[PDB]
């Protein structure tokens, strides 16, 4: 279920994300690369990237756009960490294009893990981050399951 964050936890999430927020595209590029390198089955899910060596696509506009769009959503989630309806709407809107896609929960969770690992958070900040991410996935998976209207 969705579990709201405290004022102090919101601050922790904002602070945790600050290094990434100040280098959003650069972080996106690195994290998305590491994701596709560690879990190569996922590259084929992206039609613009399918059929090319990862090292060949990593420097392309197609690749950087995809990475940027993932991180822009997370950036907007962080922006809305204190507004549950707003946070839910960000996810609801991005969920639509994923509904019909053959992407496992494993793949989504693998991406979450790459992001977590890159952030090297202490346990206080990590706890708050995981509260937000648990909310993210609750909303996302509800929407993938056709129960997105509950957040409207």
**Shortest CB 4 distance to ligand HEM, Å:** 20
Q: Is 24 in the site for ligand HEM (CB under 6 A)?
A: no
CA 14 from chain center: how many Å? Answer: 15
User: Are the CB atoms for 124 and 68 separated by under 8 Å?
Assistant: no
The size of the interface with ligand HEM (CB under 6 A), counted in residues, is 17
Q: Please give the residues from 100 up to 119 whose contact with ligand HEM meets the rule CB under 6 A.
A: 101, 103, 107-108, 111
> Measured from the CB atom, is 5 or 77 closer to ligand HEM?
77
End-to-end CA distance of the chain: 16
Could you give the string, one character per residue 59-88, with x where binding to ligand HEM holds by CB under 6 A and - elsewhere? -------x--xx--xx--------------
Name the nearest CA neighbour of 11 among 93, 111, 127, 112.
127
The token pair that represents 63 in the structure block: 């690749």
CB 50 within 8 A of CB 44: yes
Residues that bind ligand HEM (CB under 6 A): 42, 45-46, 48, 66, 69-70, 73-74, 94, 97-98, 101, 103, 107-108, 111
């Amino acid at each position: 279920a969705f579990v709201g964050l405290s004022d102090s936890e919101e601050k922790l999430v904002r602070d945790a994300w600050a290094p990434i927020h100040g280098d959003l595209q650069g972080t996106a590029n690195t994290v998305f690369y590491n994701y596709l390198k560690k879990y190569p089955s996922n590259q084929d899910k992206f039609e613009t990237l399918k059929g090319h060596p990862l090292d060949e696509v990593k420097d392309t506009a197609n690749f950087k756009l995809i990475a940027g769009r993932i991180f822009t959503i997370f950036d907007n989630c962080v922006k809305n960490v204190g507004n549950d309806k707003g946070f839910q709407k960000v996810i609801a809107d991005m969920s639509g294009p994923h509904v019909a896609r053959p992407i496992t929960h494993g793949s989504y969770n693998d991406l979450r893990g790459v992001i977590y690992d890159s952030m090297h958070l202490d346990s206080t900040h990590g706890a708050a981050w995981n509260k937000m991410m648990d909310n993210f996935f609750y909303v996302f998976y509800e929407c993938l399951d056709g129960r997105c209207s509950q957040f409207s």
